[PDB]
Ligand binder design. Sequence first.
Ligand SMILES: *[C@@H]1O[C@H](CO)[C@@H](O)[C@H](O)[C@H]1NC(C)=O
Ligand SMILES: [Ca+2]
Length: 347
Amino acid sequence: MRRELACEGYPIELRCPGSDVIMVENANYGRTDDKICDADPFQMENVQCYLPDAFKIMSQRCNNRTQCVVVAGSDAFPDPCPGTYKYLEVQYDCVPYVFVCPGTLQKVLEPTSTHESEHQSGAWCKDPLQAGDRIYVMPWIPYRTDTLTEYASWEDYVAARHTTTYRLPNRVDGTGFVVYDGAVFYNKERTRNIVKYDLRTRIKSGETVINTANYHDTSPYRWGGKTDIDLAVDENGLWVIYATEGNNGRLVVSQLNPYTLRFEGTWETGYDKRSASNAFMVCGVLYVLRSGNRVDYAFNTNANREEPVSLAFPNPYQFVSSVDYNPRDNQLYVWNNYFVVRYSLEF
Ligand SMILES: *[C@@H]1O[C@H](CO)[C@@H](O)[C@H](O)[C@H]1NC(C)=O
Ligand SMILES: [Ca+2]
């Protein structure tokens, strides 16, 4: 994380790479060390001067912005130690697009519907970190799934006008995969491991074996078809939805770091995967499809408590391939029985 300093009276400016925005993670206005901002050795003596309130002052002015004009003076900041020279030490990070929870899910709408695709099963998702209409379409074919196609826009996909073709080094084992910061997260065929293939660099950059998780048609969805592992991205981050022997057939949702490829916890839900249609994450809350085509189960990982909220979902066809949520547009990317569809939501 980036760090910048400015003495008492001198302004501080936090710059972000081009389109990115400031995110304050640590801040203090005072003195921690004597050697910094030389003025008077008598004034430099107090090395225990702190102002914890400096966080909110910086966060209110710098966040959701590329740059911020903040002056480390007595006018904007309160003096914590009178008769001591001060400096502002700020530890921050730049984000391409920051995301916050829009609200609570109620009824799923029906707008934006695409044509009858070439294949019955597959998955499609937009990059939540990249601003634009870049569509990553991955058609699923049994025992030979291996290529992702790129499309410039909704108009570009319906007209069969593709931008590029990506030949993955491993075969895909399931439909509902996910694209995060130009990197594809997919399950390897005949294995419990997930591969991170960065399309940006066009080279493999990580692989993590998911322990106790049932792989390759062992524990897929109601229709089957190698969907043992279904990746989803929400407002919180990256999630890996699967089923273990430890939970006994039930869904095991776990948070995974997109860059370190390490786990940030493991949760247990009370809903069968063999009865489930397709699971996706929204604001850290799980939602499991049932196909009587509606979502009945929901589990809050942040609260570690479930809620059986039987809420309406648009009934498409008897064959549902993949249902994944995109937190950027707050829409549902659904591939089911050839037909590919977007869906707006109630908040
Ligand atoms: C990329 O590499 C593959 C395999 O070596 C080759 O078939 C393909 O033509 C290359 N793409 C181009 C046109 O650069
Ligand atoms: Ca899903």
